[PDB]
Symmetry: C2
Subunit: 130 residues, 2 copies
Amino acid sequence: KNVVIYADGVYDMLHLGHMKQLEQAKKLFENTTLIVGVTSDNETKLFKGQVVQTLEERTETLKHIRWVDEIISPCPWVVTPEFLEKYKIDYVAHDDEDIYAWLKRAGKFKATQRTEGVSTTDLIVRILKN
Amino acid sequence: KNVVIYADGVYDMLHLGHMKQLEQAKKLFENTTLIVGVTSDNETKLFKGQVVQTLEERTETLKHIRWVDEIISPCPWVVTPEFLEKYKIDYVAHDDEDIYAWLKRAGKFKATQRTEGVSTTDLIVRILKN
């Protein structure tokens, strides 16, 4: 009955938006194991953009999050069909050409949603006003 | 065998330092309930200083933290002997005239430690360097 969910991300400067998305992934089924993948510094910078926190710093915050059962750190930048078999992953949970088309084709994709404005970036934007 | 621990604080822009301190409070005994108190905006500003996040925002992040079992939000600014009886609190866990002298006199004080440099403040100080 237990369903293995895989949620990968950069998880830089973790905020409420990330936490609610992890909650959503954890609660996709009644009984789950939520594995979180944390992207490497090099690949994040190479493919996405600057990261504030190191891999070690981003990974350590995640172990304090209620919803997180297991962590793969660093994780592969691109999910492969082989990765799913290796870790017995039933669904990939991530926000939504389409690099997820093959997961949806297989019935293994579970969309999760981000929250805007809750970001550590925005909180410093809110300050300074004084 | 279950021990009720009370850890109050502002918990503004929660970072790894706060999370490790909550972990420490949760793990003071083999079996605990960790109650976290979240200070009101007014009293925090009046007695300590500016707060970035609202009470609602500081409280909501805490419900995502593995170690947190219960939340009192808002909490009283000053712990009283009556508060301990009301909530059946066995120990107050907080970093260390001495407003905690009466708790230590009663055997009800458990010191916990903060971590420096892990603060959201310092992370923006680390950036900008680019």
